[PDB]
Amino acid sequence: SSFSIYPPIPGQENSLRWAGKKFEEIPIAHIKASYNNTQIQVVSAAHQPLAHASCGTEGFRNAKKGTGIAAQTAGIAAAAKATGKGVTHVRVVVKGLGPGRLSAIKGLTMGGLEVISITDNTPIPHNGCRPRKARRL
Amino acid sequence: SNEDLPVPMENPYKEPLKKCILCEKHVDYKNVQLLSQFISPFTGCIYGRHITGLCGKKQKEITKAIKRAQILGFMPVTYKDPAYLKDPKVCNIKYRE
Amino acid sequence: ATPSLRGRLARLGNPRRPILKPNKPLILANHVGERRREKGEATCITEMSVMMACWKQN
Amino acid sequence: ANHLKFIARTVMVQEGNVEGAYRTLNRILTMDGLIEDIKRRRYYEKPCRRRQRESYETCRRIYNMEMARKINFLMRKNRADPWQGC
Amino acid sequence: VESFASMLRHSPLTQMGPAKNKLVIGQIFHIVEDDLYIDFGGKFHCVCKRPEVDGEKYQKGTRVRLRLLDLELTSRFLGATTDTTILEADAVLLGLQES
Amino acid sequence: QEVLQLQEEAKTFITRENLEARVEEALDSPKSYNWAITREGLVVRPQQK
Amino acid sequence: PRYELALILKAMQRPETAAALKRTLEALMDRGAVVRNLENLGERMLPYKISAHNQRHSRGGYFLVDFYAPATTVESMMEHLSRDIDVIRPNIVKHPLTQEVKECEGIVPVPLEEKLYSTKKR
RNA sequence: AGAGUUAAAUUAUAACUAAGCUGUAAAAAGCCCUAGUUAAAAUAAAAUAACCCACGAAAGUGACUCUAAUAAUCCUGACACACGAUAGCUAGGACCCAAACUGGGAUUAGAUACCCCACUAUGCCUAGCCCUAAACCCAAAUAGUUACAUAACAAAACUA
Ligand SMILES: [Mg+2]
Ligand SMILES: [Mg+2]
Ligand SMILES: [Mg+2]
Ligand SMILES: [Mg+2]
Ligand SMILES: [Mg+2]
Ligand SMILES: [Mg+2]
Ligand SMILES: [Mg+2]
Ligand SMILES: [Mg+2]
Ligand SMILES: [Mg+2]
Ligand SMILES: [Mg+2]
Ligand SMILES: [Mg+2]
Ligand SMILES: [Mg+2]
Ligand SMILES: [Mg+2]
Ligand SMILES: [Mg+2]
Ligand SMILES: [Mg+2]
Ligand SMILES: [Mg+2]
Ligand SMILES: [Mg+2]
Ligand SMILES: [Mg+2]
Ligand SMILES: [Mg+2]
Ligand SMILES: [Zn+2]
Structure with a gap:
């Protein structure tokens, strides 16, 4: 069994389907995991938003919505609203480094949704704008 | 008048010096294949000496050639071009364990 | 291979400018x-949350 | 942003076990320093402060490297001692 | 009478040249459980592990074939004035004295 | 030697006459600069595909 | 060979490509250049999307032009290729065949550095 | 020093979708002309390479390209000459993002601070000033030696 960690380039003849779709046709689950909050949006391959759920949307409040639990809860919710609109498989894109990263991912699985590929796109400037100053002078 | 005394010659036994994989090759910004060998496939970072194992000279030539290629529009910056994924693996890094 | 120590520390002989300023001397300790x-x-947090959902619901 | 999507920092999960894929990703990013970099760019760090860090890191590395080297060199002699109660 | 120089020049230890990768003959003068202390005649003994094949054929007094790597294991470490001696030699145990 | 060398190479340069021919010529003949290395110090070339 | 012109042309059909190459080389010979050779590295998908002349480009044709030119003129040619709407992106490098390879004799191993500290007994 | 260029971010700005978003040890205030995704000029700043140790007199300099270019047949030498980090001043232009000040929110006995949010001078470009730094590698320049020889600590001791 030859299993490549690398995704299937578009120009390639490569045949893999999940429910008959190409790797490209599969919906995308965007997850922004930021230190005070985690947001999730499931979207069409064609970029029409299917479902949105955030820790705020899930009725946690200020500090509590930072935590992993919250993130997971948002995951489950997102996946429900998603499977309603009939998305079986989804490719995760994780944006940001937070307390809610992994948790919201496996919440997407817990909530009855299937994750094929998990990508990290975190902004990494190659030195654009200067970030704010350090805490405790 | 002792003939058995040692002779002040240079060491005959001394080994040759080890060579960068590229000693006396020519690194050219135009071939993205050779370059794309010294990149991380997932990130597009340039590997260090302690990975590539190059004479300082070549590590430098490689870096400069890379950056040149990347801006003249030969080679992609953020990921190793998928075509060259299956070429020979020169570098010492192991991601998957 | 160990990083080079030549030329790095600030010494009376060294032509150039320091690269390292070691906080405490580089001498292998015994x-x-x-x-x-x-x-x-925390442990068990996932199973906890699943149970808590089960309660809130029922 | 102008690059093609999904070719980079992407891992494909195998036999549906996601925890493992994620672990692999996180190892990829730790290895290339992307993680430390992300973390260090949350706040700014003024140039002198950065100079100081690099220097401390390299010292630290030299020392660990060399200590390790002496460990792996001395390692043979950990064997049961031949001369016991001489 | 033979001048010391004359002796040194013809000795087998001078004949060898560099001691890396040299096939040599050595003799086991001491044993701890799997550890064979082998005198190959140079300066320091080496120490090799008793192989799996014909383990019981290796006894104090036996003769064996070695591949010499280093005559003495020595290195300088960060911050030291002199090198450190392990007081041992580096060898690979091949087989025993095929005869 | 240099002057003779360049004397030779000059026969081959692109000029107001050769423009039409040469361009159409180069549009026919793709070249690669690509090659890879092996851990051994060996060159590997793609044209065998 | 003195300069190398790296041309990335908009990807087009045969005749129009040929035209663009022709007019480009002509401009080169008018800035006083002597053109040695014309190489075609083929048309590929560009490594990233390149925005030029109110167009966002995906593919492109690749060409090299080796030529000798008076030092003054690189700025001129550069100006010219800038405003041609058929060029995706121009660059002019000192020809890589002018620089010649010195011989790595090998890797000189660096000994650990000594006497960085005094002989003090702690 | 010039001139030209831009990959990763970021933002004006629309398009969908969601009611929240931001923010902390924890909150509040702020914003909901907000947030996520998809598209994007300008401006500014230059991941990885660098576990390298190069260039410059020093201050300084590490995206890419080209042009020009790094005094002395090489001792020392000013108050003379020419430079000189950041901040600051004058005038014109820029403004993504950061931010003294200031205004809000917390904290506290107080809090004219540390922490949160907004925003300015300023950081940028052109031209001119200003001439200061823990401008410190706290180790003057040029030739040398490893002899004699431990105040202490530190980066061993010394000759001309
Ligand atoms: Mg202070
Ligand atoms: Mg200097
Ligand atoms: Mg100290
Ligand atoms: Mg951009
Ligand atoms: Mg604007
Ligand atoms: Mg409020
Ligand atoms: Mg950069
Ligand atoms: Mg000079
Ligand atoms: Mg003078
Ligand atoms: Mg100044
Ligand atoms: Mg100023
Ligand atoms: Mg002004
Ligand atoms: Mg402002
Ligand atoms: Mg601010
Ligand atoms: Mg106040
Ligand atoms: Mg200027
Ligand atoms: Mg300074
Ligand atoms: Mg002083
Ligand atoms: Mg002086
Ligand atoms: Zn080499």
């Missing part, structure tokens, strides 16, 4: 350090 005990994190 003992090693003691392993750092692992920081704990």
Whole structure:
């Protein structure tokens, strides 16, 4: 069994389907995991938003919505609203480094949704704008 | 008048010096294949000496050639071009364990 | 391979400008350090949350 | 942003076990320093402060490297001692 | 009478040249459980592990074939004035004295 | 030697006459600069595909 | 060979490509250049999307032009290729065949550095 | 020093979708002309390479390209000459993002601070000033030696 960690380039003849779709046709689950909050949006391959759920949307409040639990809860919710609109498989894109990263991912699985590929796109400037100053002078 | 005394010659036994994989090759910004060998496939970072194992000279030539290629529009910056994924693996890094 | 020490430290002979300023002298000590005990994190949190959902619902 | 999507920092999960894929990703990013970099760019760090860090890191590395080297060199002699109670 | 120089020049230890990768003959003068202390005649003994094949054929007094790597294991470490001696030699145990 | 060398190479340069021919010529003949290395110090070339 | 012109042309059909190459080389010979050779590295998908002349480009044709030119004129040619709407992106490098390879004799191993500290007994 | 260029971010700005978003040890205030995704000029700043140790007199300099270019047949030498980090001043232009000040929110006995949010001078470009730094590698320049020889600590001791 030859299993490549690398995704299937578009120009390639490569045949893999999940429910008959190409790797490209599969919906995308965007997850922004930021230190005070985690947001999730499931979207069409064609970029029409299917479902949105955030820790705020899930009725946690200020500090509590930072935590992993919250993130997971948002995951489950997102996946429900998603499977309603009939998305079986989804490719995760994780944006940001937070307390809610992994948790919201496996919440997407817990909530009855299937994750094929998990990508990290975190902004990494190659030195654009200067970030704010350090805490405790 | 002792003939058995040692002779002040240079060491005959001394080994040759080890060579960068590229000693006396020519690194050219135009071939993205050779370059794309010294990149991380997932990130597009340039590997260090302690990975590539190059004479300082070549590590430098490689870096400069890379950056040149990347801006003249030969080679992609953020990921190793998928075509060259299956070429020979020169570098010492192991991601998957 | 160990990083080069030549030319690095500030010394009366060295032509150039320092690269390292070592906080304490680089001399191998005759003992090693003691392993750092692992920081704990909460356990069972997932199963807890699943049970709590089951309760809130029922 | 102008690059093609999904070719980079992407891992494909195998036999549906996601925890493992994620672990692999996180190892990829730790290895290339992307993680430390992300973390260090949350706040700014003024140039002198950064100079100081690099220097401390390299010292630290030299020392660990060399200590390790002496460990692996001395390692043979950990064997049961031949001369016991001489 | 033979001048010391004359002796040194013809000795087998001078004949060898560099001691890396040299096939040599050595003899086991001491044993701890799997550890064979082998005198190959140079300066320091080496120490090799008793192989799996014909383990019981290796006894104090036996003769064996070695591949010499280093005559003495020595290195300088960060911050030291002199090298450190392990007081041992580096060898690979091949088989025993095929005869 | 240099002057003779360049004397030779000059026969081959692109000029107001050769423009039409040469361009159409180069549009026919793709070249690669690509090659890879092996851990051994060996060159590997793609044209065998 | 003195300069190398790296041309990335908009990807087009045969005749229009040929035209663009022709007018480009002509401009080169008018800035006083002597053109040695014309190489075609083929048309590929560009490594990233390139925005030029109110167009966002995906593919492109690749060409090299080796030529000798008076030092003054690189700025001129550069100006010219800038405003041609058929060029995706121009660059002019000192020809890589002018620089010649010195011989790595090998890797000289660096000994650990000594006497960085005094002989003090702690 | 010039001139030209831009990959990763970021933002004006629309298009969908969601009611929240931001923010902390924890909150509040702020914003909901907000947030996520998809598209994007300008401006500014230059991941990885660098576990390298190069260039410059020093201050300084590490995206890419080209042009020009790094005094002395090489001792020392000013108050003379020419430079000189950041901040600051004058005038014109820029403004993504950061931010003294100031205004809000917390904290506290107080809080004219540390922490949160907004925003300015300023950081940028052109031209001119200003001439200061823990401008410190706290180790003057040029030739040398490893002899004699431990105040202490530090980066071993010394000759001309
Ligand atoms: Mg202070
Ligand atoms: Mg200097
Ligand atoms: Mg100190
Ligand atoms: Mg951009
Ligand atoms: Mg604007
Ligand atoms: Mg409020
Ligand atoms: Mg950069
Ligand atoms: Mg000079
Ligand atoms: Mg003078
Ligand atoms: Mg100044
Ligand atoms: Mg100023
Ligand atoms: Mg002004
Ligand atoms: Mg402002
Ligand atoms: Mg601010
Ligand atoms: Mg106040
Ligand atoms: Mg200027
Ligand atoms: Mg300074
Ligand atoms: Mg002083
Ligand atoms: Mg002086
Ligand atoms: Zn080499």
